[PDB]
Amino acid sequence: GAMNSSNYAELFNNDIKLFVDDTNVYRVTVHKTFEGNVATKAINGCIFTLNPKTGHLFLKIIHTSVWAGQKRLSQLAKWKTAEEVSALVRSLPKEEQPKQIIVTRKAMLDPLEVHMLDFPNIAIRPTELRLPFSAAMSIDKLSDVVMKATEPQMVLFNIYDDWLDRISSYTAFSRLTLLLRALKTNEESAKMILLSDPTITIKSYHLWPSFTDEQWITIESQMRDLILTEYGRKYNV
Amino acid sequence: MNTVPFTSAPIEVTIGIDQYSFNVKENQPFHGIKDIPIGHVHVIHFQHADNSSMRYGYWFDCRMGNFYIQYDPKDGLYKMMEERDGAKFENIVHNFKERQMMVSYPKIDEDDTWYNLTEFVQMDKIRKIVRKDENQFSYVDSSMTTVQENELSDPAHSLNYTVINFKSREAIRPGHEMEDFLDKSYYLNTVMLQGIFKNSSNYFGELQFAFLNAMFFGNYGSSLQWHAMIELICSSATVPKHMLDKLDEILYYQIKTLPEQYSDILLNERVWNICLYSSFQKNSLHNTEKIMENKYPELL
């Protein structure tokens, strides 16, 4: 059944699982036409498929050509996501295939279930958590590779950089969700926090800056402050 | 016109014959039902006065044999049996008719209800859904589960309806996942009609039989089957025009006949709202939609 606060530690046990987030699959800019009507122009998107235990991110880039001549794109986008996730699972060796796939949006359940009929032992699960994976395109290196793509492409990342050398998966996931929650609530401020000290850099092979343990505590504290502030504003409290 | 004699009526019981029903008192001199129309299947059914639990009954066709009812005090129910001695049977019936101890199948001449509810129902198909090959009639009751229910436990006592499952490999062609899930025409027309049922008549027959078992015995798996077979048609974009028109008639008489007070449990809100208002065939069931709106607008 559904993944929630109560069974949260299950994410970091030794049963392979993947989160699938489809928020950024179908992306458009809305604009006016010469005649003064409204039209959309699609831009490249991505499926965000993440092992929360290991940090392995399967970033399937969705090139705008996949929508050409198609109708009901927001509905197609769910099925295209399900198709690509099923293709990913089939591409993996048996011992790497997940035992569970957790979809961040309930509308992915039926599309993914139907595409995974060949895998009856892989459980498709919703979640009650409000996870911030939509903010993945606020990570500069992920946004860059999606926008530059000229054809469908899968790009592999570790979204935790080297953090697991020093911290556990639970703590790594907590840091990731705090970072993404901050970038979602106030991207400009979040990004200011992460880069304010020019001496801390992002390794070529990493996504986030190379903070010491002590600097991560300061960073994490700055992100929580950002999130609470915004919240009182949003709600006036 | 045929007759189903009763040996006796030792326990107080409400007896149904098709859409009609009579209360019989303990040891009342009831000896059966005469003037049963030839040409249709029929169902005689029972609910004991002391246990309003387990409605049960027998599907039969008088053209296939001479059948009677006899109470069994060991198993505690009214049992249908076949009398093979034709002369012994005619003599029993004639005596009971002479003593006027039989109720008459009370069909109004203008009334096509039973025909309309059983138009495609055939005894030979009933006997494949209800497997008990030593009898020519078929026992059904409130508690019997379907093959599909069992998959999700005694198989001899199952209702072997055709399994329909919208998220199954049978329903979904590899490579046509979205297409086949959103437009079930392939599953309806190729898998089910051409493949399994062979023609629309056998499909409607099973649909009608599932409804009748839901209505007369409160059989929940039968209700599930009835709704599934409706939903599979309504969720198909491509259905023969003759099927849609017949479906409207079939469902109209089913909704017309349903007890008004049972709409809460025998009618699945999601299916009916989807079928009448969202599905491909939302505009193809005028009679059924009109009677549903005037008779059960709460459900919608």
From Swiss-Prot, chain A:
Species this chain originates from: Saccharomyces cerevisiae (strain ATCC 204508 / S288c)
* Comment field (misc): Present with 468 molecules/cell in log phase SD medium.
Where, per UniProt, does this protein localize?
Nucleus
Return the annotated region ranges for RNase H homology domain.
7-237
Free-text comment on this protein's domains from its UniProt entry? The MPN (JAB/Mov34) domain has structural similarity with deubiquitinating enzymes, but lacks the residues that would bind the catalytic metal ion. Contains a region with structural similarity to reverse transcriptase, presenting the classical thumb, fingers and palm architecture, but lacks enzyme activity, since the essential metal-binding residues are not conserved.
Q: Which residues form a coiled coil?
A: none
Lineage of origin: Eukaryota, Fungi, Dikarya, Ascomycota, Saccharomycotina
Q: How does it assemble?
A: Component of the U4/U6-U5 tri-snRNP complex composed of the U4, U6 and U5 snRNAs and at least PRP3, PRP4, PRP6, PRP8, PRP18, PRP31, PRP38, SNU13, SNU23, SNU66, SNU114, SPP381, SMB1, SMD1, SMD2, SMD3, SMX2, SMX3, LSM2, LSM3, LSM4, LSM5, LSM6, LSM7, LSM8, BRR2 and DIB1.
Q: Its function?
A: Functions as a scaffold that mediates the ordered assembly of spliceosomal proteins and snRNAs. Required for association of BRR2 with the spliceosomal U5 snRNP, and the subsequent assembly of the U4/U6-U5 tri-snRNP complex. Functions as a scaffold that positions spliceosomal U2, U5 and U6 snRNAs at splice sites on pre-mRNA substrates, so that splicing can occur. Interacts with both the 5' and the 3' splice site, as well as the branch region. Has a role in branch site-3' splice site selection. Associates with the branch site-3' splice 3'-exon region. Also has a role in cell cycle.
Section of the entire sequence shown: 1836 to 2069 of 2413
Q: What is this protein called?
A: Pre-mRNA-splicing factor 8
From Swiss-Prot, chain B:
One of the record's GO cellular component terms: U5 snRNP
Keyword list (alphabetical) reads: Cytoplasm, mRNA processing, mRNA splicing, Nucleus, Phosphoprotein
Task: Give a short account of its post-translational modification.
Answer: Phosphorylated on serine and tyrosine residues.
Q: Just give the chief location class.
A: cytoplasm
GO biological process entries = spliceosomal snRNP assembly; spliceosomal tri-snRNP complex assembly
UniProt-listed InterPro entries: AAR2, AAR2_C, AAR2_C_sf, Aar2_N, AAR2_N_sf
Where in or outside the cell it occurs: the entry states: Cytoplasm; Nucleus
* Pfam family for this entry, one: AAR2
Specify the signal sequence span: none
What happens when you mutate residue 236 to D/E? Disrupts interaction with PRP8
In this chain, the stretch annotated as Leucine-zipper covers 244-265
Q: Which residues carry this modification: Phosphothreonine?
A: 257
Q: What else is known?
A: Present with 7330 molecules/cell in log phase SD medium.
Its biological purpose: Component of the U5 snRNP complex that is required for spliceosome assembly and for pre-mRNA splicing. Involved in splicing pre-mRNA of the A1 cistron and other genes that are important for cell growth.
Q: Which PANTHER family match?
A: A1 CISTRON SPLICING FACTOR AAR2-RELATED, PROTEIN AAR2 HOMOLOG
Q: Provide the assembly information.
A: Heterodimer. Interacts with PRP8 (via RNase H homology domain and MPN domain), competing with BRR2 for the same binding site. Component of a U5 snRNP complex that contains at least the U5 snRNA, PRP8, SNU114, AAR2, SMB1, SMD1, SMD2, SMD3, SME1, SMX2 and SMX3, but is not a component of the U4/U6-U5 tri-snRNP complex.
Family, as annotated: Belongs to the AAR2 family.
Name assigned to this protein: A1 cistron-splicing factor AAR2
Its gene name is AAR2
